[PDB]
């Protein structure tokens, strides 16, 4: 409703870096808000794409941002009569970034890994990896829970059970308020998908450079399965956390599986021990239900609600014809111990191929009426196809069915404006929460500042 669409702030990165693929707000130890930006095709030392991360100080004018430096050199360790190898070429550092406390977590989902033992190998595969930084102190750490030292022949004998070689850990990420990092790895267990969790404090204290294979004892991974419904489901394509079991001492996980059960798609709510509490099934095959998940109380009852995006949903129209437009589903949490029901509200896109629902950002309370609101991206929506971000306001009964404000992309065609979103943080300290929007096609980030309601 009250985002300012006239005076925007633009940050930018190098051409072709895909600056803006992921972003988040970062508060330093003094509370000063900045913007961490992931650029997964930033060039490295060998003039090869490795990705990069930028930490943007808040300025109304915007402009260039200084780099958050990470190690980009390939590593090799000869230990235990084996040879461990990491490969950072085209790893995509900055394909997801998330901030918690004064720590930044940036991940390279396609970092490759291999182990050589004489003529045998583990196979060069994308286990993924995440890099952690404390910018004020310069502390660095890494976390790569899918690296293993099992040889290829073994997996074949055991029928690829517990095969974490293609995890792509860090594909999606989130940190609990208590400080537990939770990585989505949609390629884990031979493309079923797994989650990896470990406290940030223990990631730092258990990491030493050059070890490559180290134990994080406090970590917790999800479980493999023989059920074909989970095969090729990409469990962990998206991840979020919230409170859904009524026990405030426990933190529940929301996991997106957009090709679960033969591309029907699913979203599951679990406890911290990966025991399944609920499962929302997709409505239509190949709609990619579960592509994006968002958790926020939208109706002001104190119970977190759930939003799920299906950007490829094909809406029925006259003459038995479908139209791919995208759809968002709102699930309101019922009072006490009860299952989430049918969706409370369905929001459906308008522009063909617009991919309404590709990203869903909690905004906090934008207009300051007591109800939290959301922003929904349609990165190829709008009457020109350049991309649109639509704001829907919370109310006593859920969300409004019509948008209160529509942001049209300021960038040229193909910018994928809105592919990444983040809100619910007041960056200029005016009392109103603001919205940062990524447009990795244009290698830029637009900042929308909220203003008093007119």
């Amino acid at each position, epitope marked *: 409703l009250n985002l300012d669409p006239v005076q925007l702030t633009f940050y930018a990165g190098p051409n072709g870096s895909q600056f803006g693929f992921s972003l988040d707000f970062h508060k330093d130890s003094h509370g000063r808000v900045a913007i961490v930006v992931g650029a997964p095709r930033t060039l490295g030392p060998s003039q090869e794409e490795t990705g990069g991360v930028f930490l943007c100080p808040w300025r109304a004018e915007g402009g260039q941002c200084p780099s958050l430096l990470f190690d980009l050199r390939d590593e090799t360790r000869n*230990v*235990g*009569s084996q040879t461990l190898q990491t490969f950072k070429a085209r790893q995509g550092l900055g394909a997801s970034v998330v901030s918690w406390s004064d720590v930044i977590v940036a991940c390279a989902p396609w970092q490759h890994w291999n182990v050589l033992e004489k003529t045998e190998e583990a196979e060069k595969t994308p286990v993924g990896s995440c890099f952690l930084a404390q910018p004020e102190s310069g502390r660095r750490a890494e976390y790569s829970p899918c690296r293993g030292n099992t040889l290829s022949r073994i997996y074949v004998e055991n029928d690829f059970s517990w095969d974490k070689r293609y995890c792509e850990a860090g594909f999606s990420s989130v940190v609990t308020q208590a400080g537990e990092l939770v990585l989505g790895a949609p390629g884990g267990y031979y493309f079923l998908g797994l989650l990896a969790q470990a406290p940030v404090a223990d990631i730092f204290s258990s990491y030493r450079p050059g070890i490559l*294979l180290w*134990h994080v004892s406090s970590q917790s991974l999800s479980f493999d399965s023989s059920n074909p419904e989970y095969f090729d489901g990409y469990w962990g394509y998206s991840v979020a956390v919230g409170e859904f079991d009524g026990d405030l001492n426990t933190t529940e996980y929301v996991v997106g599986a957009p090709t679960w059960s033969w591309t029907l798609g699913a979203v599951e709510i679990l406890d911290s021990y990966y025991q399944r509490l609920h499962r929302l099934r997709g409505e239509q095959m190949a709609s990619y239900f579960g592509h994006s998940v968002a958790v926020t109380d939208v109706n002001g009852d104190g119970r977190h609600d759930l939003l799920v995006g299906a950007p490829l949903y094909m809406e029925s129209r006259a003459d038995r014809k479908l139209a791919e437009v995208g759809r968002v589903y709102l699930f309101l949490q019922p009072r006490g111990p009860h299952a989430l029901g049918a969706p409370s509200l369905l929001l459906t896109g308008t522009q063909l191929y617009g991919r309404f629902g590709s990203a869903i950002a909690p905004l906090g309370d934008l207009d300051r009426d007591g109800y939290n609101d959301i922003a929904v991206a349609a990165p190829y929506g709008g009457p020109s196809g350049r991309g649109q971000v639509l704001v829907f306001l919370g109310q006593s009964e859920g969300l409004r069915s019509r948008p209160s404000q529509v942001l049209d992309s300021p960038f040229p065609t193909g910018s994928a404006f809105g592919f990444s979103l983040r809100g619910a943080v007041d960056i200029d300290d005016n009392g109103y929460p603001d919205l940062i929007v990524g447009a990795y096609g244009a290698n830029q980030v637009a900042v929308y500042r909220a203003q008093p309601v007119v």
Partner: antibody
Amino acid sequence: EVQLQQSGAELVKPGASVKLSCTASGFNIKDTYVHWVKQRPEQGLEWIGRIDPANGYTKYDPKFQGKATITADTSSNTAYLQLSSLTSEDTAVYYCVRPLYDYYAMDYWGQGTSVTVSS
Amino acid sequence: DILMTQSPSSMSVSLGDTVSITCHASQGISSNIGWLQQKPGKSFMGLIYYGTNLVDGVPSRFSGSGSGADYSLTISSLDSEDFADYYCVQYAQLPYTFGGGTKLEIKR
């Protein structure tokens, strides 16, 4: 806290066998490698072998191929070392070891089981 | 196998002295070495792993260094508890192999 609690001292005859035990305390035995080391006053320290209790695969120094047999039961959270056809030279103190962070290290140690072979 | 030549076999030193144990391998092991401490009539405790990294709980007066096939353990200001046996162990290759050991004795 990580503690490796081994079995009591053994006192056996030559030609017989003995099965030492290493029970994990404060952690799951399945988490890391478990090794076995043999100590003697003159000969010093010697590496027997290792096991990954998650899958049961083992590695051995070829000097102990035949006598040493390392197994692991994740149920009782315990690792075992079986010694066969015992000899006066099998009189030694035996330790079970696991690493702290590095996959390949030797950081945490049990108290050690004393073995004595004699007729 | 890899032969770990640890020297000296023993040393007579006093409290507060800064001493240094060394360990020489038959081939390069690229910092894949650990250091161990066995107090008299007791079990082992881990001091160093990967050549330089202290095990959790070990005081900072201990420090490891070196590269290639030559490494060193150093104790700055000896404590009355540091008088014990010390061993090096390489894990660059299986089988793991240990050093001969070094006994710190009280000088008088």
